[PDB]
Amino acid sequence: HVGTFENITAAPADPILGLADLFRADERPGKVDLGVGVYKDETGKTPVLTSVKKAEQYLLENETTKTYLGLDGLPEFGRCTQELLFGKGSALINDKRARTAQTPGGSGALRVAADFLAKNTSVKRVWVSNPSWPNHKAIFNSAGLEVREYAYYDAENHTLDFDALINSLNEAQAGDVVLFHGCCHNPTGADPTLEQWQTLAQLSVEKGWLPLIDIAYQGFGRGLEEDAEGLRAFAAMHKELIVASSCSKNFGLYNERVGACTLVAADSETVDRAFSQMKAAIRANYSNPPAHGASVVATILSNDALRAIWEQELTDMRQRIQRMRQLFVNTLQEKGANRDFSFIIKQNGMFSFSGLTKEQVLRLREEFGVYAVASGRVNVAGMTPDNMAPLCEAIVAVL
Amino acid sequence: HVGTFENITAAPADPILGLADLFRADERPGKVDLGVGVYKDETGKTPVLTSVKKAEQYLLENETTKTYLGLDGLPEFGRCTQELLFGKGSALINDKRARTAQTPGGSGALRVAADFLAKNTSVKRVWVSNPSWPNHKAIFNSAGLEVREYAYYDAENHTLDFDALINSLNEAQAGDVVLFHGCCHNPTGADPTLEQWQTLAQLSVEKGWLPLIDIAYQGFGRGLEEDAEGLRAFAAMHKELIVASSCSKNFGLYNERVGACTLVAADSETVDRAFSQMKAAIRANYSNPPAHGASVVATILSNDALRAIWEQELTDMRQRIQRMRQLFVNTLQEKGANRDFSFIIKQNGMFSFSGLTKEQVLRLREEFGVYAVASGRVNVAGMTPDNMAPLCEAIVAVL
């Protein structure tokens, strides 16, 4: 009997992982990694938030059991998530039109959403932005859903090409899913204005798309409430919505896998039937979600003083990111960049497309020890007042 | 446009949940819940282990980041898992034939296995015991794999009907997966002897089955090393294996979702190829596993003092269960049960089929506040010295 595994073809190697290895082995003292995928503070660390440490001590001191949570996780975490997303006092919440399952990260929410749709609806196609967040295609394809891309970013001119966006969406059919990033578009940082969100929401009602909002950076854009405006514009207009949310970045809980899939339907009965089937999708997967991270979030948000410490931490991160965005543009100019990079100050979150070609990216690594990903995506949280000048000199030298 | 969710049908009611509802609204003081799915101590609680609390204190003091780990999770947790399963000095480990991905529970492991097999192999069917763990079917079916049942338990006579077992497996084709519970068969508590494990392993090699060992109770049967005998008998004989393991029960870490999927192939290069595609299955699912629980486990297993504490805790749980099994049988006898329940003393782990009819189970609930599931499965960890007499009196009354 030949082995069942004997003829398996290896998955292609992950280029970013190979880059990370190369960086680790790089002995040049001037190296800088702009290709990283998480937040980093001014010292180049990704620390545990003090609010999180305090919450963890509280749990250490007060938790008396690890017995299984239900399929939908910690109820208080679901309530806190819904309040963050829709606002406390939302008619949506009051009308009991929303149900939330705590999931292993926003990624887990996306997969749960995909399995639920594939098994319980006629959805056959999910639309994502160009450029896309690479993991979306893998997740949706895995449930048998086709993924198509709509027009979004004008890379030559560094804008969200809104007219191209809405025209390209004419190809989306009633009952297709259309996925939008809630704020801090990953990887461009280019977000719809509120007026644009309202136009998209109206169009979605007219065409009959089911909107899916991926929101993993609430609070990194302009603020907690402002970053939810687009989601809330959709929520005001639609009978139905799916939200895949994450606390990986805004609570710095990446590896604890804390997020949620929220369903919204026309009425309480409908969301309840749908939610019963989403629970079935969970039962066939990882069964119930990991408690530690969600418990931390609930513990922070439920307590006035702790919540205050966390919101200041979040504000700190957002403002450091905005500072590096401004310092990057100003230093490029100072170093005599032969181009305008103002689009950087107009973009939200830690990621932007630098507009560098793959050849310039390669040159940046080999010659200058400045690491970005092949697409030219840079993480501005990889920048500091101390590494900014040489990094920008390098970029100018490559233009 | 009409809604995507409107025509969704409500999932069938979850009887277990409904029984838990009933139990909670039951205001009677003599209640006894034998239907629970977790360990309970002599006071009826499911405590956090002392070794776990100590480990969590240490992580609170020491952790400086929660940034993402790789798709396979924490390397040290993977190694500690492999040691537990295969033993120190395993030729298989020495030959670099195994790879382990940390997963959200044994459930996550089983789903990761299913997706990996469906996408990368010609496996069409997974064989499971009659009866088996309730969630197996949904998990494997979700990945597109047919689930078939093999003969296992003789309910009238309370035995593992081994001849029926091996004859029923003649129907399993080369390349099919055959799933065995590693120890403490859930829900019968009836396990193969070592000799029967060896016979099964030989048949498997001759027939060309791919064995999958589902092990969630290592340490609850006879002891850590003893409970691995069956898995190791398969390991000795096979070029290929899959193990889905769980720390939910032996570490009391249920809600932290800590388990693993381990692949074994003929050699290192082959398992590398296979494991790379397993990682791809993870990436399309929840992306990376939850750190807290696995970190706790690695912390405990890597420290001699802590490990000794945990082992004593595990021994205490195993022995409380064995003692309740013995007390149950002895108390039924002296309460004049019209039947022999001696089979209970021989069985491994917290579950057995009581052999009670659904009429008797209903009557136990309605008249006596004694709760079991419809199948008559009981969890002996729901029994205590203080509740044993009234419990056995009720059972006797319904016989």
Sorted by where each begins, the domain ranges of chain B are: 14-47+319-399, 48-318
Q: Is B247 exposed, middle or buried (0-12, 13-18, 19+ CB in 10 A)?
A: buried
**B residues 106-135 closer than 8 Å to A (CB):** 107-108, 111, 115, 120-123, 135
**A residues 36-75 closer than 8 Å to B (CB):** 37-38, 45-48, 52-53, 56-57, 60, 63-69
Distance CA A259, CA A269 (A): 24
| A98 shares contact with chain B (CB less than 8 Å) | no
Segments of B224-366 assigned E as strands: 241-246, 258-264, 351-353
Distance CA B219, CA A249 (A): 38
Give Cβ neighbours of residue A234 (< 8 Å, ≥ 6 apart): A180, A197, A200, A201, A204, A211, A213, A241
| β-sheet bridge partners, residue B244 | B214, B261
User: Do the beta carbons of residue A354 and residue A378 sit within 8 Å?
Assistant: yes
Distance CA A275, CA A101 (A): 9
- Token representation of residue A397: 């030298």
CA-to-CA separations, B119 to A8, A10, A70, B191, B274, in angstroms, rounded: 10, 13, 30, 32, 11
Query: What Rg do the C-alpha atoms of chain B give, in angstroms?
Result: 22
φ/ψ (deg, to 5) at A84: -55, -50
- Sheet containing B125-130: give its strands across: B98-104, B258-264, B241-246, B210-215, B177-181, B125-130, B146-151
| Chain A closest-CA separation from residue B358 CA (Å) | 26
Residue B151 in 3-state DSSP? strand
Pairing status of strand B351-353 against strand A377-379: unpaired
Q: Look at the alpha carbons of B181, B186, B188, B190 in this order and tell me if their dihedral is positive or negative.
A: positive
Give the length of chain A.
399
Pairing status of strand B159-160 against strand A210-215: unpaired
Question: Of the candidates A325, A217, A291, A260, which has an alpha carbon nearest to the alpha carbon of residue A98?
Answer: A260
Chain B residues touching residue A4 (CB < 8 angstroms): 121-123, 175, 210, 240
- Angle (CA) A241-A247-A253 rounded to 5° is 155
Q: Which long-range contacts (CB under 8 A, 24 or more apart) does B27-32 make?
A: B28/B369, B30/B368, B30/B369, B30/B390, B31/B369, B31/B370, B31/B371, B32/B369, B32/B370, B32/B371, B32/B382, B32/B383, B32/B387, B32/B390, B32/B391
Distance CA A377, CA A387 (A): 18
User: Do the beta carbons of residue A296 and residue A55 sit within 8 Å?
Assistant: yes
Segments of chain B assigned E as strands: 32-33, 98-104, 125-130, 146-151, 153-154, 159-160, 177-181, 210-215, 241-246, 258-264, 351-353, 370-371, 377-379
Angle between helices A388-398 and A304-334 (to 10 degrees): 40
User: Do the beta carbons of residue B226 and residue B88 sit within 8 Å?
Assistant: no
Give Cβ neighbours of residue A141 (< 8 Å, ≥ 6 apart): A147, B284
Distance CA A29, CA A218 (A): 35
Architecture of the structural domain at A14-47+319-399: Alpha-Beta Complex (3.90)
CATH of domain B48-318: 3.40.640.10
Query: What Rg do the C-alpha atoms of chain A give, in angstroms?
Result: 22
Task: Please tell me what DSSP assigns to residue B127.
Answer: E
Chain A residues touching residue B11 (CB < 8 angstroms): 273, 276-277, 279-280
Q: Return the residue in B46, B62, B67, B278 with the most chain A beta carbons within 10 A, the one to mutate for interface testing.
A: B67
- The one catalytic residue in B40, B214, B227, B279 is B214
Which residue in the set A4, A9, A120 is minimally distant from B240, CB to CB? A4
User: Do the beta carbons of residue A121 and residue A306 sit within 8 Å?
Assistant: no
Residue B45 in 3-state DSSP? coil
Question: Of the candidates B190, B251, B194, B262, which has an alpha carbon nearest to the alpha carbon of residue B217?
Answer: B251
Contact A66 B53 (CB under 8 A): no
| Residue A384: CA count within 13 A, CB half-sphere | 13
Distance, first Cα to last Cα, chain A: 58
Which residue in the set A255, A288, A291 is minimally distant from B66, CB to CB? A255
Distance CA B278, CA B100 (A): 10
The total of other beta-carbon atoms located within 10 Å of residue B90's CB is 17
User: Do the beta carbons of residue B306 and residue B98 sit within 8 Å?
Assistant: no
Distance CA A100, CA A115 (A): 16
Give me the DSSP letters along A376-396: -EEEGGG--TTTHHHHHHHHH
Give Cβ neighbours of residue B379 (< 8 Å, ≥ 6 apart): B34, B35, B36, B37, B40, B350, B351
Pairing status of strand B241-246 against strand B258-264: antiparallel
> Is B133 one of the annotated active-site residues of the chain?
yes
Contact B47 A68 (CB under 8 A): no
Task: Please tell me what DSSP assigns to residue B73.
Answer: B
Residue A77 in 3-state DSSP? helix
Contact B68 A254 (CB under 8 A): yes
User: Do the beta carbons of residue B22 and residue B14 sit within 8 Å?
Assistant: no
The two domains A14-47+319-399 and A48-318 share their CATH topology (first three levels equal) = no
Tell whether residue B37 is among the known ligand binding residues: yes
Record the resolution, in angstroms: 2.0
User: Do the beta carbons of residue A178 and residue A170 sit within 8 Å?
Assistant: no
| Residue B187: CA count within 13 A, CB half-sphere | 24
Tell whether residue A186 is among the known ligand binding residues: yes
- Token representation of residue B214: 């589902």
- Token representation of residue B212: 């999958």
φ/ψ (deg, to 5) at A129: -75, 155
The total of other beta-carbon atoms located within 10 Å of residue B367's CB is 11
Segments of B94-139 assigned E as strands: 98-104, 125-130
Residue A184 in 3-state DSSP? coil
Q: Is B114 exposed, middle or buried (0-12, 13-18, 19+ CB in 10 A)?
A: buried
| Chain A closest-CA separation from residue B337 CA (Å) | 34
Contact B135 A266 (CB under 8 A): no
Residue B246 in 3-state DSSP? strand
Distance CA A148, CA A160 (A): 18
Residue A212 in 3-state DSSP? strand
- Token representation of residue B326: 């013995």
Distance, first Cα to last Cα, chain B: 60
User: Do the beta carbons of residue A347 and residue A190 sit within 8 Å?
Assistant: yes
| Chain B closest-CA separation from residue A343 CA (Å) | 29
Distance CA A327, CA A305 (A): 33
User: Do the beta carbons of residue A218 and residue A227 sit within 8 Å?
Assistant: yes
Distance CA A111, CA B104 (A): 14
> Is B214 one of the annotated active-site residues of the chain?
yes
| Residue B267: CA count within 13 A, CB half-sphere | 3
Pairing status of strand A177-181 against strand A125-129: parallel
Segments of chain A assigned E as strands: 32-33, 98-104, 125-129, 146-150, 153-154, 159-160, 177-181, 210-215, 241-246, 258-264, 351-353, 370-371, 377-379
CA-to-CA separations, A29 to A25, A387, A390, B345, in angstroms, rounded: 11, 11, 12, 67
Give Cβ neighbours of residue B12 (< 8 Å, ≥ 6 apart): none
Q: Which long-range contacts (CB under 8 A, 24 or more apart) does B122-125 make?
A: B122/A4, B122/B175, B123/A4, B123/B175, B123/B176, B123/B177, B123/B210, B124/B175, B124/B176, B125/B172, B125/B173, B125/B176, B125/B177
Residue B356 in 3-state DSSP? coil
Question: Of the candidates B298, B373, B362, B349, which has an alpha carbon nearest to the alpha carbon of residue B189?
Answer: B349
Distance CA B235, CA B238 (A): 6
Distance CA A32, CA A390 (A): 10
Distance CA A118, CA A112 (A): 10
Q: State the amino acid at position B1 in one-letter form.
A: H
User: Do the beta carbons of residue B343 and residue B5 sit within 8 Å?
Assistant: no
Residue B101 in 3-state DSSP? strand
Contact A135 B283 (CB under 8 A): yes
Contact B292 A256 (CB under 8 A): yes
Question: Of the candidates B121, B122, B116, B176, which has an alpha carbon nearest to the alpha carbon of residue B143?
Answer: B116
Question: Of the candidates B127, B97, B87, B108, which has an alpha carbon nearest to the alpha carbon of residue B245?
Answer: B108
- Token representation of residue A248: 């990986």
Helices within A169-267 (DSSP H only): 194-207, 229-237
Distance CA A289, CA A93 (A): 23
| β-sheet bridge partners, residue A104 | A258
Distance CA B9, CA B11 (A): 6
**B residues 271-290 closer than 8 Å to A (CB):** 271-274, 276-277, 279-281, 283-290
**A residues 289-308 closer than 8 Å to B (CB):** 289-293
Contact B290 A255 (CB under 8 A): yes
Distance CA A48, CA A38 (A): 13
Which residue in the set B45, B69, B265 is minimally distant from A3, CB to CB? B265
Tell whether residue B133 is among the known ligand binding residues: yes
Distance CA B283, CA B2 (A): 34
User: Do the beta carbons of residue A178 and residue A148 sit within 8 Å?
Assistant: no
Angle between helices B50-62 and A50-62 (to 10 degrees): 160
CA-to-CA separations, B1 to A92, A105, A180, A210, B6, in angstroms, rounded: 20, 32, 20, 10, 11
Chain B residues touching residue A263 (CB < 8 angstroms): 5
Q: Look at the alpha carbons of A238, A241, A247, A248 in this order and tell me if their dihedral is positive or negative.
A: negative
- Angle (CA) A119-A121-A127 rounded to 5° is 100
- Token representation of residue A118: 């594939």
CA-to-CA separations, B390 to A118, B312, B352, in angstroms, rounded: 50, 31, 19
Catalytic positions of A:
133, 214, 249
| B78 shares contact with chain A (CB less than 8 Å) | no
Give Cβ neighbours of residue B29 (< 8 Å, ≥ 6 apart): none
Task: Please tell me what DSSP assigns to residue B147.
Answer: E
**A residues 309-368 closer than 8 Å to B (CB):** none
- Token representation of residue B7: 């025509």
Q: State the amino acid at position A161 in one-letter form.
A: D
Distance CA A94, CA A100 (A): 14
Kindly identify which residue of chain A lies nearest to residue B114, measuring between CA atoms. A285
- Angle (CA) A180-A181-A186 rounded to 5° is 130
Which residue in the set B69, B142, B252 is minimally distant from A66, CB to CB? B252
- Token representation of residue A17: 């992982």
Give Cβ neighbours of residue B103 (< 8 Å, ≥ 6 apart): A286, B73, B109, B112, B244, B259, B260, B261, B282, B289
| Residue B303: CA count within 13 A, CB half-sphere | 15
Distance CA B374, CA B358 (A): 5
φ/ψ (deg, to 5) at B47: -75, 160
Contact B280 A138 (CB under 8 A): yes
User: Do the beta carbons of residue B98 and residue B314 sit within 8 Å?
Assistant: no
User: Do the beta carbons of residue B350 and residue B323 sit within 8 Å?
Assistant: no
Angle between helices B291-301 and B304-334 (to 10 degrees): 100
Measured in whole angstroms, the distance separating CA B288 from the mean position of its chain's CA atoms is 22
